Each structure stands twice: as structure tokens, then as C-alpha cells.
Coordinates of C-alpha atoms in Angstrom, one line a residue:
Chain A
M1 CA -6.9 4.1 -9.1
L2 CA -6.1 2.2 -12.3
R3 CA -7.7 1.7 -15.7
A4 CA -7.8 -2.0 -16.6
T5 CA -9.5 -4.5 -18.8
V6 CA -11.3 -7.6 -17.5
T7 CA -9.3 -10.6 -18.9
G8 CA -10.8 -13.6 -17.0
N9 CA -12.8 -15.2 -14.2
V10 CA -11.2 -16.7 -11.1
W11 CA -13.1 -19.3 -9.0
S12 CA -12.0 -20.1 -5.5
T13 CA -14.2 -22.7 -4.0
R14 CA -11.9 -23.6 -1.0
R15 CA -11.7 -20.1 0.5
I16 CA -11.6 -18.4 3.9
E17 CA -14.7 -17.2 5.5
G18 CA -15.9 -13.7 5.2
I19 CA -15.9 -13.0 1.5
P20 CA -19.1 -11.2 0.4
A21 CA -21.3 -11.9 -2.6
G22 CA -19.5 -11.0 -5.9
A23 CA -16.9 -12.3 -8.4
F24 CA -13.1 -12.5 -8.6
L25 CA -12.0 -11.2 -11.9
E26 CA -8.6 -11.1 -13.5
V27 CA -7.8 -7.7 -14.9
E28 CA -4.9 -6.3 -16.9
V29 CA -3.8 -2.8 -16.1
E30 CA -3.7 -0.5 -19.2
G31 CA -0.3 0.4 -20.5
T32 CA 1.7 -1.8 -18.2
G33 CA 0.0 -5.1 -18.9
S34 CA 0.3 -5.9 -15.1
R35 CA -2.2 -8.4 -13.9
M36 CA -4.1 -8.6 -10.7
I37 CA -7.3 -10.2 -9.4
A38 CA -10.0 -7.6 -8.4
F39 CA -13.3 -8.1 -6.7
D40 CA -16.4 -7.2 -8.6
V41 CA -19.9 -6.4 -7.5
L42 CA -21.2 -4.6 -10.6
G43 CA -21.4 -7.7 -12.8
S44 CA -18.5 -6.8 -15.1
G45 CA -17.7 -9.1 -18.0
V46 CA -14.6 -10.2 -19.8
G47 CA -13.3 -7.5 -22.2
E48 CA -14.9 -4.7 -20.2
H49 CA -12.8 -1.6 -19.3
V50 CA -13.0 -0.9 -15.6
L51 CA -11.7 1.4 -12.9
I52 CA -10.0 -0.2 -9.9
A53 CA -9.3 0.9 -6.4
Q54 CA -6.7 -0.8 -4.2
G55 CA -5.8 -1.3 -0.6
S56 CA -8.0 -0.9 2.5
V57 CA -10.6 1.3 0.7
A58 CA -11.6 -1.8 -1.3
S59 CA -12.5 -3.6 2.0
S60 CA -14.0 -0.7 3.9
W61 CA -16.6 -0.1 1.1
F62 CA -18.5 -3.2 2.2
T63 CA -21.2 -3.4 4.9
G64 CA -20.8 -6.1 7.6
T65 CA -17.4 -7.4 8.6
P66 CA -14.8 -5.8 6.3
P67 CA -13.6 -8.6 3.9
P68 CA -10.0 -9.6 3.1
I69 CA -10.2 -7.8 -0.3
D70 CA -7.6 -5.3 -1.5
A71 CA -8.8 -4.6 -5.1
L72 CA -12.3 -3.5 -6.1
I73 CA -13.8 -2.6 -9.4
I74 CA -15.4 0.7 -8.7
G75 CA -16.9 1.5 -12.0
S76 CA -17.1 0.7 -15.7
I77 CA -15.3 3.0 -18.1
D78 CA -17.2 4.5 -21.1
Chain B
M1 CA -5.3 -9.6 -5.0
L2 CA -2.6 -11.8 -6.7
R3 CA -2.4 -15.3 -7.9
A4 CA 0.7 -17.1 -6.5
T5 CA 2.2 -20.5 -6.1
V6 CA 3.3 -21.8 -2.7
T7 CA 7.0 -22.8 -2.9
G8 CA 7.8 -23.6 0.6
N9 CA 7.5 -23.0 4.4
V10 CA 9.3 -20.4 6.3
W11 CA 10.6 -21.5 9.6
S12 CA 11.0 -18.8 12.2
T13 CA 13.4 -19.1 15.1
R14 CA 11.5 -16.5 17.2
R15 CA 8.6 -14.1 16.7
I16 CA 7.2 -11.0 18.3
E17 CA 4.0 -11.6 20.2
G18 CA 0.6 -11.5 18.6
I19 CA 1.0 -13.8 15.6
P20 CA -2.0 -16.1 15.3
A21 CA -2.1 -19.8 14.6
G22 CA -1.2 -20.5 11.0
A23 CA 1.9 -20.8 8.8
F24 CA 4.3 -18.5 7.0
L25 CA 4.6 -19.7 3.4
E26 CA 6.9 -18.6 0.7
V27 CA 5.0 -17.9 -2.5
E28 CA 5.9 -16.9 -6.0
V29 CA 3.7 -14.4 -7.8
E30 CA 2.4 -15.7 -11.1
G31 CA 3.8 -13.9 -14.1
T32 CA 6.2 -11.6 -12.2
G33 CA 8.1 -14.4 -10.5
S34 CA 8.4 -12.1 -7.4
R35 CA 8.6 -13.8 -4.1
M36 CA 7.0 -12.9 -0.8
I37 CA 5.9 -14.5 2.5
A38 CA 2.2 -14.9 3.0
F39 CA 0.3 -16.0 6.1
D40 CA -1.8 -19.1 5.7
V41 CA -4.7 -20.4 7.8
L42 CA -6.1 -22.9 5.2
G43 CA -3.4 -25.6 5.3
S44 CA -2.2 -24.7 1.8
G45 CA 0.4 -27.0 0.3
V46 CA 3.7 -26.6 -1.7
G47 CA 2.9 -26.3 -5.4
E48 CA -0.6 -25.1 -4.7
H49 CA -2.0 -22.1 -6.6
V50 CA -3.5 -19.6 -4.2
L51 CA -5.1 -16.1 -4.1
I52 CA -3.4 -13.5 -1.8
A53 CA -4.6 -10.3 -0.3
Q54 CA -2.1 -7.7 0.9
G55 CA -1.9 -4.8 3.3
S56 CA -4.0 -4.0 6.3
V57 CA -6.9 -6.1 5.1
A58 CA -4.8 -9.2 5.7
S59 CA -4.5 -8.3 9.4
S60 CA -8.1 -7.1 9.8
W61 CA -9.5 -10.6 8.9
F62 CA -8.4 -11.8 12.3
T63 CA -10.4 -11.6 15.4
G64 CA -8.7 -10.1 18.4
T65 CA -5.7 -7.8 18.5
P66 CA -4.7 -6.9 15.0
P67 CA -1.8 -9.1 14.0
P68 CA 1.3 -7.8 12.3
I69 CA 0.5 -9.5 9.0
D70 CA 0.5 -7.8 5.6
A71 CA -0.2 -10.8 3.3
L72 CA -2.9 -13.5 3.6
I73 CA -3.8 -16.5 1.5
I74 CA -7.6 -16.2 1.0
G75 CA -8.3 -19.3 -1.1
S76 CA -7.0 -21.8 -3.6
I77 CA -7.6 -21.3 -7.4
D78 CA -10.0 -23.7 -9.0
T79 CA -8.9 -25.3 -12.2
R80 CA -11.8 -23.8 -14.2
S81 CA -10.3 -20.3 -13.6
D82 CA -9.3 -18.7 -16.9
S83 CA -7.1 -15.9 -18.2
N84 CA -6.5 -14.2 -21.6
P85 CA -4.5 -11.3 -22.8
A86 CA -6.4 -8.0 -23.1
Chain C
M1 CA 3.2 12.1 -2.3
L2 CA 4.2 12.5 -5.9
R3 CA 4.5 15.2 -8.5
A4 CA 2.4 14.5 -11.5
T5 CA 1.0 16.1 -14.6
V6 CA -2.7 15.9 -15.6
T7 CA -2.9 14.1 -18.9
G8 CA -6.5 13.2 -19.4
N9 CA -9.7 11.9 -17.8
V10 CA -12.0 8.9 -17.3
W11 CA -15.7 8.8 -17.8
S12 CA -17.5 6.2 -15.7
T13 CA -21.3 6.0 -15.9
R14 CA -21.9 2.8 -14.1
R15 CA -20.3 3.1 -10.7
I16 CA -20.6 1.6 -7.2
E17 CA -22.3 3.9 -4.6
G18 CA -20.1 6.3 -2.6
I19 CA -18.0 8.2 -5.1
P20 CA -17.9 11.9 -4.1
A21 CA -18.5 14.9 -6.3
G22 CA -15.4 15.5 -8.4
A23 CA -13.6 14.1 -11.4
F24 CA -11.5 11.0 -12.3
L25 CA -8.3 12.5 -13.9
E26 CA -5.5 10.6 -15.6
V27 CA -2.1 11.8 -14.3
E28 CA 1.5 10.9 -15.2
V29 CA 4.1 10.8 -12.4
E30 CA 7.0 13.1 -13.2
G31 CA 10.2 11.5 -14.1
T32 CA 8.8 8.0 -14.2
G33 CA 6.1 8.4 -16.8
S34 CA 3.9 5.9 -14.8
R35 CA 0.2 6.7 -15.1
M36 CA -2.7 6.4 -12.8
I37 CA -6.2 7.8 -12.1
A38 CA -6.5 10.3 -9.3
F39 CA -9.6 11.9 -7.9
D40 CA -9.9 15.7 -8.3
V41 CA -11.9 18.2 -6.3
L42 CA -10.0 21.4 -7.0
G43 CA -10.5 21.9 -10.7
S44 CA -7.1 20.8 -12.0
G45 CA -6.9 21.2 -15.8
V46 CA -5.2 19.0 -18.4
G47 CA -1.5 19.8 -18.5
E48 CA -1.4 21.1 -14.9
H49 CA 1.3 20.1 -12.5
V50 CA -0.2 18.6 -9.3
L51 CA 0.6 16.9 -6.1
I52 CA -0.9 13.4 -5.4
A53 CA -1.5 11.4 -2.2
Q54 CA -2.2 7.7 -2.4
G55 CA -3.8 4.9 -0.4
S56 CA -6.4 5.2 2.3
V57 CA -5.6 8.8 3.2
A58 CA -7.2 9.7 -0.2
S59 CA -10.5 8.3 1.1
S60 CA -10.3 9.3 4.8
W61 CA -9.9 12.9 3.7
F62 CA -13.6 12.9 2.8
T63 CA -15.2 12.8 6.2
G64 CA -18.0 10.4 6.8
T65 CA -18.5 7.1 5.0
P66 CA -15.2 6.2 3.3
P67 CA -15.3 6.5 -0.5
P68 CA -13.6 3.8 -2.5
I69 CA -10.9 6.2 -3.7
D70 CA -7.1 5.6 -3.3
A71 CA -5.6 8.6 -5.1
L72 CA -6.3 12.2 -4.6
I73 CA -4.9 15.4 -6.1
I74 CA -4.2 17.5 -3.0
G75 CA -2.8 20.7 -4.6
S76 CA -1.4 22.5 -7.6
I77 CA 2.3 22.9 -7.8
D78 CA 3.7 26.4 -8.3
Chain D
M1 CA 5.9 -10.0 4.3
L2 CA 9.6 -10.1 3.2
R3 CA 12.7 -11.9 4.1
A4 CA 15.6 -9.6 4.8
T5 CA 19.0 -9.3 6.4
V6 CA 19.9 -6.7 9.0
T7 CA 22.8 -4.7 7.7
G8 CA 23.1 -1.9 10.3
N9 CA 21.8 0.4 12.9
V10 CA 20.3 3.8 12.2
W11 CA 20.6 6.5 14.7
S12 CA 18.0 9.3 14.8
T13 CA 18.3 11.8 17.5
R14 CA 15.9 14.4 16.3
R15 CA 12.5 12.7 16.0
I16 CA 8.8 13.5 16.0
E17 CA 6.9 12.5 19.1
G18 CA 5.4 8.9 19.3
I19 CA 8.2 6.6 18.3
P20 CA 8.1 3.6 20.6
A21 CA 11.0 2.1 22.6
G22 CA 13.1 0.1 20.2
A23 CA 15.6 0.5 17.4
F24 CA 15.7 1.5 13.7
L25 CA 17.6 -1.1 11.7
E26 CA 18.7 -1.0 8.1
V27 CA 17.8 -4.2 6.3
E28 CA 18.4 -5.6 2.8
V29 CA 15.5 -7.6 1.2
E30 CA 16.6 -11.0 0.0
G31 CA 16.9 -11.6 -3.7
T32 CA 16.1 -8.0 -4.7
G33 CA 18.8 -6.4 -2.6
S34 CA 16.4 -3.5 -1.9
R35 CA 17.1 -1.7 1.3
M36 CA 14.7 -0.1 3.8
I37 CA 14.7 0.8 7.5
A38 CA 12.5 -1.4 9.8
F39 CA 11.6 -0.9 13.4
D40 CA 12.8 -3.6 15.8
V41 CA 11.7 -4.6 19.3
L42 CA 13.3 -8.1 19.5
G43 CA 16.9 -7.0 19.7
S44 CA 17.9 -8.1 16.2
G45 CA 21.6 -8.0 15.4
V46 CA 23.6 -7.1 12.3
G47 CA 23.7 -10.1 9.9
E48 CA 20.5 -11.6 11.3
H49 CA 17.9 -12.9 8.9
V50 CA 14.5 -11.5 9.7
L51 CA 10.9 -11.3 8.6
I52 CA 9.3 -7.9 7.9
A53 CA 5.7 -6.6 7.8
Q54 CA 5.0 -3.3 6.1
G55 CA 2.4 -0.6 6.1
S56 CA 0.0 0.3 8.8
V57 CA 0.0 -3.2 10.4
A58 CA 3.5 -2.3 11.7
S59 CA 2.0 0.6 13.6
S60 CA -1.2 -0.9 14.7
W61 CA 0.8 -3.7 16.5
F62 CA 1.6 -1.2 19.2
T63 CA -1.0 -0.6 21.8
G64 CA -2.3 2.9 22.1
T65 CA -1.7 5.9 19.8
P66 CA -0.5 4.8 16.4
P67 CA 3.2 5.3 16.0
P68 CA 4.4 6.7 12.7
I69 CA 6.1 3.4 11.7
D70 CA 5.5 1.5 8.5
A71 CA 7.9 -1.4 8.8
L72 CA 8.4 -3.8 11.7
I73 CA 10.6 -6.9 12.2
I74 CA 8.2 -9.5 13.3
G75 CA 10.6 -12.4 13.7
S76 CA 13.9 -14.1 13.0
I77 CA 14.3 -16.8 10.3
Chain E
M1 CA 10.7 3.4 6.3
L2 CA 13.2 5.0 3.9
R3 CA 16.5 6.8 4.2
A4 CA 16.4 9.9 2.0
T5 CA 18.1 13.2 1.4
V6 CA 16.1 16.5 1.2
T7 CA 16.7 17.9 -2.3
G8 CA 14.3 20.9 -2.3
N9 CA 11.1 22.6 -1.4
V10 CA 7.7 22.2 -3.1
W11 CA 5.2 25.1 -3.1
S12 CA 1.4 24.8 -3.8
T13 CA -0.6 27.7 -5.5
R14 CA -3.9 26.1 -4.5
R15 CA -4.5 23.2 -2.1
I16 CA -7.3 21.2 -0.6
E17 CA -8.4 21.9 3.0
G18 CA -7.1 20.1 6.0
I19 CA -3.4 20.1 5.4
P20 CA -1.6 20.9 8.7
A21 CA 1.2 23.4 9.3
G22 CA 4.5 22.2 7.8
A23 CA 6.3 22.0 4.5
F24 CA 6.3 19.8 1.4
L25 CA 9.9 18.7 0.7
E26 CA 11.2 16.8 -2.3
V27 CA 13.5 14.0 -1.1
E28 CA 15.7 11.5 -2.9
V29 CA 15.6 7.9 -1.6
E30 CA 19.1 6.8 -1.0
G31 CA 19.2 3.2 -2.3
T32 CA 17.4 3.9 -5.5
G33 CA 17.7 7.6 -6.3
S34 CA 13.9 7.8 -6.6
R35 CA 12.3 11.1 -5.6
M36 CA 9.1 11.7 -3.8
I37 CA 7.5 14.5 -1.8
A38 CA 7.3 14.1 2.0
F39 CA 5.6 16.3 4.6
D40 CA 7.8 17.9 7.2
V41 CA 7.1 19.3 10.6
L42 CA 10.6 19.2 12.0
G43 CA 12.1 22.0 9.9
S44 CA 14.3 19.9 7.8
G45 CA 16.7 21.6 5.4
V46 CA 18.0 20.9 1.9
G47 CA 20.8 18.3 2.0
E48 CA 19.6 16.9 5.3
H49 CA 19.4 13.1 5.7
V50 CA 16.0 12.1 6.9
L51 CA 13.9 9.1 7.8
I52 CA 10.5 8.7 6.1
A53 CA 7.3 6.8 6.9
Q54 CA 4.7 6.2 4.2
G55 CA 1.0 5.4 4.0
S56 CA -1.8 5.9 6.5
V57 CA 0.6 6.2 9.5
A58 CA 1.8 9.5 8.0
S59 CA -1.7 10.9 8.3
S60 CA -2.8 9.2 11.5
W61 CA 0.1 10.9 13.4
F62 CA -1.7 14.2 13.2
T63 CA -4.4 15.5 15.5
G64 CA -7.7 16.7 14.1
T65 CA -9.2 15.9 10.7
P66 CA -7.2 13.3 8.9
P67 CA -4.8 15.1 6.6
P68 CA -4.3 13.9 3.0
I69 CA -0.7 13.0 3.6
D70 CA 1.0 9.7 2.7
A71 CA 4.6 10.5 3.5
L72 CA 6.1 12.1 6.6
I73 CA 9.6 12.8 7.7
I74 CA 9.7 11.3 11.2
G75 CA 13.3 12.1 12.1
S76 CA 16.7 13.3 11.1
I77 CA 19.4 10.6 10.6
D78 CA 22.7 10.9 12.5

């Protein structure tokens, strides 16, 4: 998993079917400054420090048909 | 997921069986400049900014036999999307 | 798998459902100095040398519903 | 997926059970020059430009028990 | 998959449950010189050239409960 900071909001209106309710957030990984887009269900805001999981476990967390999501914010960091 | 820009189309001369309808697009990852080939079912265009998912979740989106695809464009990026350094 | 050293830990109070009992530990990969957060169930202490597995095998190790975990400390290195 | 060029053949005589029929090919990823070994079922030759998929999708392409393969040549370019 | 050379043995003082019979070997990836730890069931020795598979296919090869293994030596290279 990675520590990251939420750095922005991504909207994708023309998108494939099968994405659940939630938000696409830009995050910046701590120390490296690498960026990625992570899916969020907790309601995380810009500036928040978050913990991210990657790969198929981000998709398999969801009920219903597993979504084409490979990065999920799994918690907020205190 | 990654933001990328479509830079071109990849023309195959032959393929293994089991690849769905759709296109192989060359994309350039925003910020790193890294290139990869992503599968596209949306009719994405050259120059378009897109969102990509990687790994087995790209294949599992498809119905039927799991295709041998490890990168999928899942949408285009709206112009209101924003970014800022941490 | 990678050799890593435990360097710290993460507290997360607001989390998605499905994180198992255990701790989020910060580890540094030996030789590279790259850092990540790995889940710990053994009781690895700060400074300890550990072995890490990554990706979905970190989640599927927990039997039952897959936790949204992509890095697991699987042992202490002698 | 990645663009790569086949640079040679890899022979492995001592193997764990479950490798499918086919060949191990060394490839070089375009632009980065990174090398890896990919599995091939099409009969790709040295010098050929190919498209590679990585991770478990290389394995799950095969029907039946999952082979312990994490890179597959899925086409020629 | 990766071409690598076995560079040594890795011993665990304490490990989680569910790891099959076999050895943890340190290997050096040939193109890069990068090192990693791979699981071995073939009885590979130091100095041997081996072929490695990474990720969930390293675990799903095994019978029984999914082992927490993300790198497996699948063969020796001639």
C-alpha cells in the first residue's frame, strides 16, 4: 500500500460501463511525488492524507460486477 | 489508474485468439512520458486525454473468456478535472 | 518477495470495511530505499528485517472475503 | 501491454509441472531496452516485433489449470 | 518472466502460516542487477541460472490454501 495526498478531482463523463458510485481522485505518493488516479468511496477531499491499495484487490472489494479499477483509497491517515 | 494521452494506433499483423473487438492504442503517460499500449473500446482518438486501468482488472471487464489484456482505457478526462502539487 | 526493514507505522481511523486484525507498517526495501506500507500480523517491531509479498497474494492469504490489502509481511529474516 | 523485439530463445529443461506447449523467448522492450522472457504460442522468430501482455492475464488465457506464466506474446506488430 | 542468478539463501526466524515446503532464494535479475527473493521447489543452488514468474501465478501454482508467495522459480535455464 502507499501513503499519498489527495491533489485533485478527475471527472470522466464519457466512460465505460460498470464503474460504481464514487469519485476519481488524483493523489501524489509521499516521498516520490509519483501521481496516480485512485478511486474513492470514503468522501476524501483535496489535501487529505490517504492510504492506497493497488491492483486487483481494489476491484475485488466491490459488490456486484468487479469494476475496472486498480487503485482504491482504503483509509484516511491520521 | 493513470492519465495518459493517445498518441497513435498499433497495427498488428497477427494475434493470438481471444482478443475482443476494439483497438490497440499507443498512449503516453502524463508526467512520466512513459509509453504503453492500451486496449480501447470507446473509440478514443489521437491526442485525447484518457484514464487507464492496468492488470487483471482490464481483462475482467470483458464478458466471456478472459482476454489477454493488461491495460484498458476506461474513460476520457473532462476539462474540469484539476491537479495541484501536494 | 523483497527484503525490507520496518521503519514506522500508519494510523488510519477512517477505513473502508474489510481490513483484517493487524497493523499497517511502513517498510523500506533493502538496497533501494523505496518505501511502502505493508500489513503485519506477526508482530514485527520497528527496525526489524522482514520479508514482504505484494499484490493480490497479500489479500488472498486471508481466507474468506478478500481484504483490500496488497502488501503483507510474511516473515522475519534471520 | 508493451511493444518489444524478440532477441532470442531460452531453453529450460528442468521445469516445474504445468508449463504449456510453446516457447520461452527473450524480448527487449522498445524504447527502454528492458529485457524479459515471454511465453510464445504463435511461433515468433528472432527479430520479430511483438506485443506483450503481463501478469496473471498471461496465465488465465490458457484453458484449465493456471500455468505459472506472467508474460505472453499476444501478437505481431 | 525474468532471467536471474541464484545468489544466496534466505532464512526466516518466524513466518506466517501457509507457506509450502521449499526455500526462499535471493536472486539477481540479469539485465538490471536488481535483487529479489523467489520461492524455490526445484532445489536450485547458488550460482544457478533460473527463470522466475511473478505475481499471483506464483501462488496459484500451488495446491491447498493460497500461499503468500509472489515470485516462483519455474525452471532452470540451459
